[PDB]
């Protein structure tokens, strides 16, 4: 619980040296909707482009409602119709997804905790072992009837959403809901069991494309030991303690006089990942994987 400083410099270059030191064996990524905007899935809270800014159409009390469970229970048709608007024709993971692939392939990834539901991390080749889908996934779907709970795969869910048929179980004619965690719902047990263990021995926390304002996911940054360096790759800074909430009974500290282990690289996640890869000597490796994988997906 001492706040010793393990980076030689609070910069990307500092992080890159640390990552190739003996001190850096186990990396945890925490990622959010920002890593998937370049794959054509909009984030929620961006101005102009974010989802909440584009839900005039659905007769909603606050645009937040479309992802709230109590609303979904009353009227599920809006969520399905939105799911139709957003569902990509092609699922192509981004440079940043592939960056995490490289982490896994080099034995550095202890886990990716993701707020995304879009399966892109699996398509880039992170297995269920490497991955904690904290808000669940579109990957599978289940009948909501406690006595049934039949599982359906995405091709079935997709056909129902592109059909504009409100998806209904073939065994019982109950609603079939994608295995995502709505607002108001409990996170999956795997989330809690993983965090109780992995933050005991993490050496680096890589935070990409998240506002860190959805809880309990956001609390993950405080779970790390106090000397674990934390790098944020994001369009804007996030996770710093609010001045007022703060005053009542640790957040990211990039800039105060007290700063010792948090680094903010601000821009496109795709660029930050490329920048970090270049420093690590991985740039060719990342360019080739991304191109090979996109070509592969493009010829399906």
């Amino acid at each position: 619980s001492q706040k010793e400083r393990l980076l030689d410099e609070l910069t990307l270059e500092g992080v890159a040296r640390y990552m190739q030191s003996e001190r850096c064996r186990r990396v945890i990524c925490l990622v959010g909707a920002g890593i998937s905007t370049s794959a054509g899935i909009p984030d929620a809270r961006s101005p102009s482009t974010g989802l909440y800014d584009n839900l005039e159409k659905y007769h909603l009390p606050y645009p937040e409602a479309i992802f709230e469970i109590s609303y979904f229970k009353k009227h599920p048709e809006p969520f399905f119709a939105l799911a139709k608007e957003l569902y990509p024709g092609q699922f192509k993971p981004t440079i940043c997804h592939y960056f995490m692939r490289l982490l896994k392939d080099k034995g550095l990834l202890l886990r990716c905790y993701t707020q995304n539901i879009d399966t892109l991390e699996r398509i880039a080749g992170l297995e269920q072992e490497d991955l904690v889908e904290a808000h669940g996934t579109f990957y599978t779907s289940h009948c909501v009837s406690a006595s049934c709970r039949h599982e359906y795969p995405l091709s079935w869910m997709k056909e129902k959403i592109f059909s504009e048929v409100t998806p209904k179980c073939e065994d019982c004619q109950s609603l079939v809901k994608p295995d995502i965690v709505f607002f108001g719902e409990s996170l999956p047990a795997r989330f809690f069991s993983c965090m109780q263990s992995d933050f005991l021995k993490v050496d680096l926390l890589l935070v990409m494309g998240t506002s860190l304002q959805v809880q309990p996911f956001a609390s993950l940054i405080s779970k790390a030991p106090l000397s674990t360096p934390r790098l944020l790759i994001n369009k804007e800074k996030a996770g710093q303690s609010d001045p007022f909430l703060g005053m009542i009974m640790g957040g990211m500290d990039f800039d105060s006089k007290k700063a010792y282990r948090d680094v903010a690289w601000l821009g496109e996640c795709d660029q930050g990942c490329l920048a970090l890869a270049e420093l690590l000597g991985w740039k060719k490796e990342l360019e080739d994987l991304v191109r090979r994988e996109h070509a592969s997906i493009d010829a399906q």
Binding site: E64, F183, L187, P216
Partner: peptide, 7 residues
């Protein structure tokens, strides 16, 4: 029971 919520 810790639930999914903004804060």
């Amino acid at each position: 029971a810790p639930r999914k919520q903004l804060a």
